[PDB]
Design a binder for this molecule. Structure first.
Ligand SMILES: Nc1ncnc2c1ncn2[C@@H]1O[C@H](C[C@@H](N)CC[C@H](N)C(=O)O)[C@@H](O)[C@H]1O
Length: 461
RNA sequence: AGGGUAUAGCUCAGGGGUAGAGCAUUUGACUAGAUCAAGAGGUCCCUGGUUCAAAUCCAGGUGCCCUCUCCA
């Protein structure tokens, strides 16, 4: 609708093109169709998901209670607007709030401000602009000025600049709470509110300091993964790549905090974020460690990692990925070598995971990318190198089936869960569209118009 | 068969030979700054290799990073 295609390097876009236009897809669909599918995808990746999905912390508050509190909250934030809060029938602990946008009738002010691309993407998802996000502002900006926020999607604005000739994207208008001086004078690493969004292009609730113990902002497929893994209370679970611990805390909540959830991560601060989250939401079965997942299998001769092989009941490999399925992602200035730089690491982590898995155990491999080399190909490779593993059907089945190209059978592809951003057209929701909307339409919208994601389920013998 | 990155206080260009921009900071002028001018600034991460010569190219080392909703 409103935004152009995702600004990719020619080589990168041609890489992905090679991915989506392979011999098998061309055979089963034709070039004229597959190409349009690809372009539709690239057109969709620039726009926010049409649904703000919120995971309920069932270990501290029920879904009903949280829903009511969030009704009061939306009553407060939207000055008494009327947006519904659906409850997913398949994902029992997930709430859905529709996104009101885009709004093309926003009048652009003269006082401007430029945020980081990531900050912009956050704002489109219903976030305000906090001080560390602003990388540019009109030199005459005072606290209280109604300013227009623009997103430096290319990430080319050098911080502190008073002018920018590069690529900007209008995010909406907001009331500033800081002058340009207060932000760029001296070097105070200051925090807090910077720009209170009052007229965003996409209208979504702000989830900063609201019910921190009860909520967790989480994409629908991400919340789905922990359900697919299906952890039972009392088991031993381990997710190699865990931080900041969304799926970790979710797993812990699904087990009623009864069992043992070991979370690993490579970066220290990230592990600290895991611990902070677990302590916040009230989960005690979570134990986080700063450790290389590729070297997590015991070899030398000495409860901390590394662990003995076949010592975990269930393992979640939420492997690091290109993140090409991210929405909204209006631009990506990556090298092709950078985009395809993940398959080896994913394979190492996968091997380490299989070694650490008990027989009859479950291994769930999940990415947030769209590439074949990081998804279906990794499944084929996994089923080839490890013959003990065997692909399993999943519950709940929500996303589409696997993409042809890895040489898998249709029976195998039906057991994968690939979420396609180009599944359904972009819904330009407004209040009139809200009122005359069948619920079964909204649910399908929430299930289809999502970020790029891929889930695969394995069992050991 | 993992990758990217290290340059001025901050944010980043550049590039085999005399160190660059924006902002911040300093000074002067004009009526504290939506004004003008002026200069202050860096063993270019460590080590080794190629080379007449490496801040630049190569290798190793180390630090930081590779969002899977919101202090960016
Ligand atoms: N070799 C590695 N071993 C363990 N963790 C890694 C490794 N490389 C990257 N990571 C971590 O993988 C994480 C990828 C995250 N997106 C995981 C998100 C997490 N699954 C969640 O749902 O909240 C990064 O934060 C990395 O710190």
């Amino acid at each position: 609708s409103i935004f152009p295609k995702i600004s990719l390097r020619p080589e990168v876009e041609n890489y992905l093109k090679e991915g989506f236009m392979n011999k098998e897809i061309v055979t089963a669909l034709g070039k004229q169709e597959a190409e349009r599918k690809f372009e539709t995808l690239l057109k969709h990746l620039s726009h926010p998901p049409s649904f703000t999905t919120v995971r309920v912390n069932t270990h501290l508050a029920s879904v009903q209670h949280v829903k009511n509190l969030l009704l009061d909250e939306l009553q407060k934030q939207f000055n008494g607007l009327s947006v519904p809060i659906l409850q997913h029938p398949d994902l029992q602990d997930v709430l859905l709030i529709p996104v009101i946008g885009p709004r093309k009738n926003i009048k652009k002010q003269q006082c401007e401000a430029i945020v980081g691309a990531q900050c912009g993407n956050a704002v489109l998802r219903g976030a305000h602009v906090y001080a560390p996000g602003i990388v540019s502002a009109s030199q005459f900006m005072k606290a209280g000025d109604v300013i227009s926020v623009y997103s430096d999607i290319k990430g080319k604005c050098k911080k502190g600049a008073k002018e920018f000739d590069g690529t900007k994207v209008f995010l909406g208008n907001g009331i500033s709470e800081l002058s340009r001086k207060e932000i760029f004078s001296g070097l105070p690493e200051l925090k807090g509110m910077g720009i209170r969004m009052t007229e965003p292009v996409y209208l979504s609730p702000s989830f900063d300091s609201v019910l921190p113990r009860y909520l967790f902002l989480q994409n629908l497929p991400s919340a789905l993964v922990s359900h697919v893994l299906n952890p039972q209370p009392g088991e031993k679970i381990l997710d190699l790549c865990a931080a900041p611990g969304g799926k970790t805390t979710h797993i812990a909540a699904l087990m009623h905090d009864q069992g043992e959830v070991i979370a690993l991560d490579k970066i220290f601060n990230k592990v600290e974020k895991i611990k902070q989250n677990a302590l916040l939401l009230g989960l005690n079965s979570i134990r986080a460690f700063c450790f290389d997942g590729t070297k997590a299998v015991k070899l030398d001769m000495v409860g901390e990692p590394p662990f003995l092989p076949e010592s975990f009941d269930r393992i979640l490999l939420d492997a690091p990925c290109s993140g090409m399925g991210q929405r909204p992602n209006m631009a990506c200035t990556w090298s092709v070598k950078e985009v395809a730089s993940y398959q080896p690491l994913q394979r190492k982590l996968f091997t380490a995971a299989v070694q650490l898995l008990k027989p009859e155990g479950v291994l769930v491999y999940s990415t947030c990318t769209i590439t074949l080399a990081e998804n279906e190909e990794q499944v084929a490779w996994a089923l080839t190198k490890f013959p003990c593993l065997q692909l399993q059907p999943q519950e709940p089945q929500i996303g589409g089936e696997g993409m042809r190209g890895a040489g898998l059978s249709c029976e195998q592809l039906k057991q994968l869960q690939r979420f396609d951003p180009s599944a359904v057209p972009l819904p330009d929701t407004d209040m009139d569209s809200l009122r005359e909307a069948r619920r079964e339409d909204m649910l399908r919208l929430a299930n289809k118009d999502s970020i790029g994601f891929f889930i695969a389920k394995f069992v050991k013998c």
